Amino acid sequence: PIDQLATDSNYLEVCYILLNGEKPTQEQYDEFKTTVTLHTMIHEQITRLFHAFRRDSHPMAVMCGITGALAAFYHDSLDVNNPRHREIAAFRLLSKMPTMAAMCYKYSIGQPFVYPRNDLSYAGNFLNMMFSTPCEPYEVNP
Amino acid sequence: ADTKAKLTLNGDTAVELDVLKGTLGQDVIDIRTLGSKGVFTFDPGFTSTASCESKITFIDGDEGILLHRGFPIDQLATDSNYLEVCYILLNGEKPTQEQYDEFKTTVTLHTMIHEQITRLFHAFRRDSHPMAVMCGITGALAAFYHDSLDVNNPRHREIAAFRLLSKMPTMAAMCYKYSIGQPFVYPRNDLSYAGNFLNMMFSTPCEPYEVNPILERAMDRILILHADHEQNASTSTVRTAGSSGANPFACIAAGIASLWGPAHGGANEAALKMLEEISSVKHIPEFFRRAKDKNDSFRLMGFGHRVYKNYDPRATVMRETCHEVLKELGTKDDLLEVAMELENIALNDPYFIEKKLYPNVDFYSGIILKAMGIPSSMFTVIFAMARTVGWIAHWSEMHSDGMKIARPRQLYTGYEKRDFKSDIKR
Amino acid sequence: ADTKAKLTLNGDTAVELDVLKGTLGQDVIDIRTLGSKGVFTFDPGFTSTASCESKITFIDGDEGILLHRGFPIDQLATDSNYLEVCYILLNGEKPTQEQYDEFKTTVTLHTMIHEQITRLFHAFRRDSHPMAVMCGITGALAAFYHDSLDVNNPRHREIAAFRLLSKMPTMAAMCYKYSIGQPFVYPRNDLSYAGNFLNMMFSTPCEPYEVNPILERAMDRILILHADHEQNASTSTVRTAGSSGANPFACIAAGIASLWGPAHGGANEAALKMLEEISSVKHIPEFFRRAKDKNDSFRLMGFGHRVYKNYDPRATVMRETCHEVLKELGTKDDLLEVAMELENIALNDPYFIEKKLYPNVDFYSGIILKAMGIPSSMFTVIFAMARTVGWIAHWSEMHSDGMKIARPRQLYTGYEKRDFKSDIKR
């Protein structure tokens, strides 16, 4: 039930549940969080695509434009029939969406992009990339 | 006030004019009505004309008095700090702890410059004079900070003032980083205005930078000592452009250009270079750099000033700071015997004693900045940066007053109406 | 002379001041040596103070008179062309074929801007007002053309003068193209000044642009009618920035921002809101935009002017040309014809009669530009681009005078000297 997931689980565990069909064992979850964590950054060239969008663009139009352009950069995981390519592709989108989402915002307001922080949770990592500046340390409110 | 109530002008009919008085300085003959009476004065340069009523800065040139909101410059340069002086110039009073806290908070939160504005720097030749880059960048601000351009709107001035106030040092320091090929440094919330500046100017991502309290306080003093200087030419440009309706960023950008005007004033452009290189302790100290004084360009090299007769009151605290900074920088300030010597040449040469080419605040500021490793091209960028608070104060005062638009007359001595009939067939 | 000998100023004893005589207009009282005594006048806005002696433009507002080097504006607009008027304004006399061909050849020879400045255009936002981008590029020219900044060298001055007259049209057109996302168009040596400008505005690589003869003339006349307007707020800004020694390019940038000035308000675009986005005689000029007039909401709209009492002398020829354009463009005009209702009201409506809201030159200029398919955000850019030669001439004459540094007095009414005591700790 959605209530139990929204109150008891966390986003990454729900992802594992939707993607694997079961609540992850500590180890499976650890490995899962590990694969996601290692694929958070977006190719720097993909980052230059943001600079070609009008600063005044709707972040949702920038998000569609950026996601629709991914295939040219992550050209090695495009064979949908290939079982391993789906793993890679899924993990890529899974890890990178918040990085791109947060960048849409930073770009839309004129602040520098924030790199993922391995030391943070999916939600905290997002709030960090969305609001922190290089000017002061940012502390994620629980 | 004796006969300071009234007086009269006499062309044909006796026109009575008030003799407005000040709280300090000379009285002024209110001629605001003469124009309508078909009477107009003639004063190119406005040396006999009070363009406004001001409460900001007071100067008695002969007696060397410089007051900012009534406070002597000495006390501000030694006791206050740049941000408090800004509050003083901008608000007219010494801030209560809380008012100062809130003030420092508003400034701190608006330090970063829009990343797009940062891309403008990359379009300037790396070899550009940082002062030309500074004028170009400030003059372009209005397109980015397009929501605070209504000068008539009281809240827009708050925003605009705070924007310029917070961002100038960020832009100033970037001009330098860009001019030498090092990456830009973001403001650090944990630092003071002076320390934050020294950080953005000199730190690299390669090692931690530690702000030296001596150089820090020394920079803070260079800033306060350049905060404002009454109705000079560059500030008069700020008021004039402003009364014309020009947005704050445009008026501040104009003030910067008017400020470095003398630098590229030909005689100054050439003489500053002569002094630039010659640091051989055999020419500057032994009348070589002094050999060329046909074209003066002295105020720029730190000698003499039209405002003050015998000395520049801003140089007191700066000289004392300068002596200290030189020491702090250990056994490296050896070739700086020319600093000791040029000063001796200014205090003892009959020519300098005659023309009163005394060392001014910039002779000493220049030494502190040179001692810090800052290139000379960045000297006016720093002075203009510090002067911005004065410009904002004068621009703002000009507004809240009555917004008397600059619409002067002219003595027309040109051609009387004549007919036009072209000589060309093109 | 009426009462034009000398005059007396009394307080206790008398002071004799000479009166200068102008060839046209009113004569003035010389007060240049007053401030050299202690006696200062008080005149905010300078409306009773001649700021300089000039021979460029004579205006007799109440008579609706405007002369450029003695030539009536209506004659120049009809029988001359922009460049010839530019030649006259700068030189004092009309050109011979020899002189004109030399001037023209030189102007077209330097119309192309440095390739690196084009990069600067792209760092700006696409949503930026064309006017702000214009001011931004003008204030950045000093970072490139740094070989003509010596305002004390007639060589630099003349070179700066030509680079501005040559490149301004190029700059303006590029501001339009950038805003609409169209490729920049290069200047054509074979096309006229106005023919080239329209081409740079409307050309495209998709096919060769055909310039309509009637439209080229219209544009040239717009440029002629805006070439100069005497000692106004913008020119005074240019003259004041220049008095300090500010570089040529920086001087124009301040004039541009000054001219942009009065259009930064809130209630100014609240009425301009309706004037723009709607086309119907029963919509705008009908109990909506008419009734919606809060702060300025007039001169900028094309109704009235502070200079002229009854009418705008410049508007006469602009009104005729508007007929030729409206007649010619028809299929791209007849919908905008609602100007007759705006004019009808500005003539037959009591509110407009009482406030003397006569359709100025910008009223007709606006109608034409709107019909030619030009966005209103380019209107003042076009006027500024045109006014630039006037700014250059005034700036040159200020220097011929000897560059009298603007150093006005002030009426100080602030605090007297007081000791500084600070309690804060931040």
Side-chain angles (χ1 to χ4, degrees), chain C residues 72-332:
Chain C
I73 187 60
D74 286 323
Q75 281 182 14
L76 293 179
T78 292
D79 300 302
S80 185
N81 75 168
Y82 192 61
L83 279 190
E84 183 184 56
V85 167
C86 284
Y87 180 103
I88 297 167
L89 279 169
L90 297 171
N91 302 277
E93 314 291 350
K94 67 174 169 182
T96 306
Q97 195 66 230
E98 41 128 347
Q99 299 171 318
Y100 174 73
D101 288 355
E102 176 189 47
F103 179 87
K104 174 178 195 177
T105 280
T106 295
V107 175
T108 66
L109 216 155
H110 310 272
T111 53
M112 207 190 259
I113 54 153
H114 192 272
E115 163 173 49
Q116 187 65 39
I117 298 167
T118 296
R119 319 302 136 178
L120 177 53
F121 267 96
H122 294 272
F124 283 95
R125 299 174 57 124
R126 286 280 181 187
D127 80 335
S128 297
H129 195 98
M131 194 77 181
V133 166
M134 179 79 159
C135 305
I137 306 295
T138 314
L141 300 185
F144 304 88
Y145 304 101
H146 60 71
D147 57 309
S148 66
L149 307 190
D150 188 21
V151 299
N152 293 116
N153 191 138
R155 186 181 73 214
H156 290 35
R157 288 199 287 120
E158 184 183 34
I159 289 174
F162 267 102
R163 280 174 166 160
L164 279 162
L165 193 58
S166 297
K167 306 171 199 303
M168 276 291 142
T170 310
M171 187 174 321
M174 285 172 78
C175 288
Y176 171 61
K177 290 299 193 184
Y178 192 73
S179 75
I180 65 171
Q182 283 204 320
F184 298 133
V185 182
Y186 281 95
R188 291 267 302 284
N189 295 342
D190 61 289
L191 297 184
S192 65
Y193 178 108
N196 176 64
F197 177 65
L198 291 180
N199 191 60
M200 289 186 312
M201 288 288 278
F202 300 109
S203 166
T204 274
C206 302
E207 71 177 331
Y209 188 67
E210 207 82 297
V211 177
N212 187 323
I214 301 180
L215 295 191
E216 195 215 286
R217 187 203 320 196
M219 178 52 73
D220 193 85
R221 289 178 172 195
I222 288 177
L223 270 29
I224 288 179
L225 301 167
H226 294 94
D228 199 65
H229 212 218
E230 218 212 53
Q231 297 298 129
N232 74 163
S234 61
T235 285
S236 291
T237 290
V238 169
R239 281 181 176 263
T240 308
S243 69
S244 72
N247 75 76
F249 307 122
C251 283
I252 294 294
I256 298 175
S258 176
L259 205 70
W260 185 202
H264 288 137
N268 292 95
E269 303 113 26
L272 281 170
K273 198 94 63 186
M274 294 163 272
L275 225 200
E276 177 79 329
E277 60 199 349
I278 312 293
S279 179
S280 178
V281 281
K282 276 56 179 284
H283 203 298
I284 321 170
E286 195 183 68
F287 63 76
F288 208 8
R289 189 208 51 97
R290 300 296 195 182
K292 208 69 71 288
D293 43 48
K294 281 72 206 72
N295 296 52
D296 291 34
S297 307
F298 282 119
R299 173 177 154 184
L300 175 70
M301 304 284 265
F303 302 106
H305 197 122
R306 72 98 184 183
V307 179
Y308 310 102
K309 178 191 170 194
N310 305 309
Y311 64 99
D312 189 328
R314 300 168 299 179
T316 298
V317 172
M318 199 81 278
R319 187 178 188 279
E320 307 171 353
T321 308
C322 208
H323 169 52
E324 312 174 11
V325 169
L326 268 54
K327 176 184 177 184
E328 178 63 17
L329 290 183
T331 312
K332 300 78 63 187

Side-chain angles (χ1 to χ4, degrees), chain B residues 23 42 48 54 75 93 414 421, chain C residues 23 29 35 94 411 414-415 420:
Chain B
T23 56
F42 182 64
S48 302
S54 193
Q75 306 192 35
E93 287 295 342
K421 175 67 198 64
Chain C
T23 50
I29 298 170
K94 67 174 169 182
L411 175 60
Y415 280 102
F420 176 70

Side-chain angles (χ1 to χ4, degrees), chain A residues 18-123:
Chain A
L18 290 175
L19 292 175
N20 291 106
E22 287 295 342
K23 43 222 148 196
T25 62
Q26 181 62 91
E27 173 181 287
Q28 290 178 152
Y29 179 78
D30 289 345
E31 286 175 8
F32 185 61
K33 190 124 198 166
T34 306
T35 307
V36 172
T37 300
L38 279 301
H39 295 0
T40 51
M41 292 183 286
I42 85 163
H43 192 289
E44 292 291 311
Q45 197 56 51
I46 301 181
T47 294
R48 195 152 73 84
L49 286 171
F50 281 87
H51 302 260
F53 283 81
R54 271 124 70 156
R55 301 300 298 221
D56 46 276
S57 305
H58 185 311
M60 193 62 157
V62 182
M63 195 70 262
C64 283
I66 295 294
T67 303
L70 292 176
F73 301 86
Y74 297 124
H75 45 63
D76 53 346
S77 70
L78 307 184
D79 192 355
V80 303
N81 188 41
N82 185 145
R84 293 111 66 214
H85 272 21
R86 301 189 195 102
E87 172 244 316
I88 305 169
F91 274 117
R92 280 176 167 172
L93 292 160
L94 209 51
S95 300
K96 308 170 194 297
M97 290 308 313
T99 310
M100 297 184 279
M103 282 167 75
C104 282
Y105 178 54
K106 287 301 187 188
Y107 189 73
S108 72
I109 64 163
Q111 285 178 197
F113 293 163
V114 180
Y115 288 84
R117 284 262 304 278
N118 292 19
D119 64 301
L120 301 171
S121 65
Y122 194 109

Side-chain angles (χ1 to χ4, degrees), chain B residues 115-372:
Chain B
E115 292 291 311
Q116 197 56 51
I117 301 181
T118 294
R119 195 152 73 84
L120 286 171
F121 281 87
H122 302 260
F124 283 81
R125 271 124 70 156
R126 301 300 298 221
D127 46 276
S128 305
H129 185 311
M131 193 62 157
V133 182
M134 195 70 262
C135 283
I137 295 294
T138 303
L141 292 176
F144 301 86
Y145 297 124
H146 45 63
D147 53 346
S148 70
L149 307 184
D150 192 355
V151 303
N152 188 41
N153 185 144
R155 293 111 66 214
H156 272 21
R157 301 189 195 102
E158 172 244 316
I159 305 169
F162 274 117
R163 280 176 167 172
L164 292 160
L165 209 51
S166 300
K167 308 170 194 297
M168 290 308 313
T170 310
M171 297 184 279
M174 282 167 75
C175 282
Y176 178 54
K177 287 301 187 188
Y178 189 73
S179 72
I180 64 163
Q182 285 178 197
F184 293 163
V185 180
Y186 288 84
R188 284 262 304 278
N189 292 19
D190 64 301
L191 301 171
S192 65
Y193 194 109
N196 181 69
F197 182 61
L198 284 169
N199 186 253
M200 295 183 295
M201 276 285 287
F202 302 121
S203 74
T204 71
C206 309
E207 65 167 18
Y209 182 87
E210 295 130 20
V211 182
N212 185 160
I214 301 306
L215 301 196
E216 168 174 9
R217 182 161 284 207
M219 178 64 75
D220 185 61
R221 302 210 192 102
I222 294 178
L223 306 169
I224 294 166
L225 287 169
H226 281 87
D228 185 69
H229 221 203
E230 212 230 53
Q231 322 297 159
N232 57 197
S234 52
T235 291
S236 295
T237 299
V238 170
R239 287 179 173 265
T240 293
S243 70
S244 302
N247 71 81
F249 312 116
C251 304
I252 271 58
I256 296 177
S258 305
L259 185 109
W260 82 308
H264 49 86
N268 308 89
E269 209 186 89
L272 287 171
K273 266 119 65 187
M274 171 180 67
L275 180 152
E276 186 69 41
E277 49 181 75
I278 303 302
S279 192
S280 49
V281 304
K282 176 188 170 56
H283 293 109
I284 272 194
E286 287 146 65
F287 53 85
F288 163 86
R289 203 218 73 78
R290 289 303 190 200
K292 186 60 79 292
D293 47 28
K294 279 62 175 58
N295 324 148
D296 78 288
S297 170
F298 280 112
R299 171 170 152 176
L300 261 59
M301 304 185 286
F303 305 102
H305 197 119
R306 69 93 181 172
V307 170
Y308 304 106
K309 190 177 184 305
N310 292 309
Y311 55 95
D312 181 9
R314 298 174 298 159
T316 301
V317 171
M318 196 94 288
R319 179 180 198 276
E320 294 194 34
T321 300
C322 169
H323 189 236
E324 181 186 315
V325 163
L326 255 35
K327 295 181 173 177
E328 174 60 42
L329 299 179
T331 314
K332 219 71 64 179
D333 324 88
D334 299 351
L335 61 178
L336 261 50
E337 258 288 5
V338 312
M340 293 208 253
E341 195 58 35
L342 281 174
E343 187 192 35
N344 192 94
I345 303 175
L347 302 174
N348 298 311
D349 190 302
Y351 178 86
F352 287 67
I353 297 176
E354 181 69 37
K355 294 276 196 163
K356 292 173 176 299
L357 253 34
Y358 53 79
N360 57 43
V361 68
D362 297 327
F363 169 82
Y364 304 100
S365 289
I367 292 173
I368 297 174
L369 296 169
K370 284 163 183 174
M372 295 173 166

Side-chain angles (χ1 to χ4, degrees), chain B residues 10-11 23 29 38 40-42 45 48-50 54 75 93 97 100 116 410 412-415 421-422 425, chain C residues 3 8 23 26 29 31 35 41-42 50 52 55 57 84 92-94 97 123 407 409 411 414-415 420 425-426:
Chain B
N10 195 95
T23 56
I29 289 65
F40 307 87
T41 65
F42 182 64
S48 302
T49 310
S54 193
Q75 306 192 35
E93 287 295 342
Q97 181 62 91
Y100 179 78
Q116 197 56 51
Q410 69 168 10
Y412 181 78
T413 316
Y415 271 103
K421 175 67 198 64
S422 191
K425 187 143 288 301
Chain C
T3 183
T8 61
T23 50
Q26 264 281 217
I29 298 170
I31 65 167
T41 57
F42 184 77
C52 67
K55 307 182 179 308
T57 294
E84 183 184 56
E93 314 291 350
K94 67 174 169 182
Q97 195 66 230
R407 295 169 169 175
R409 303 292 98 131
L411 175 60
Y415 280 102
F420 176 70
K425 267 297 84 174
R426 180 177 175 153

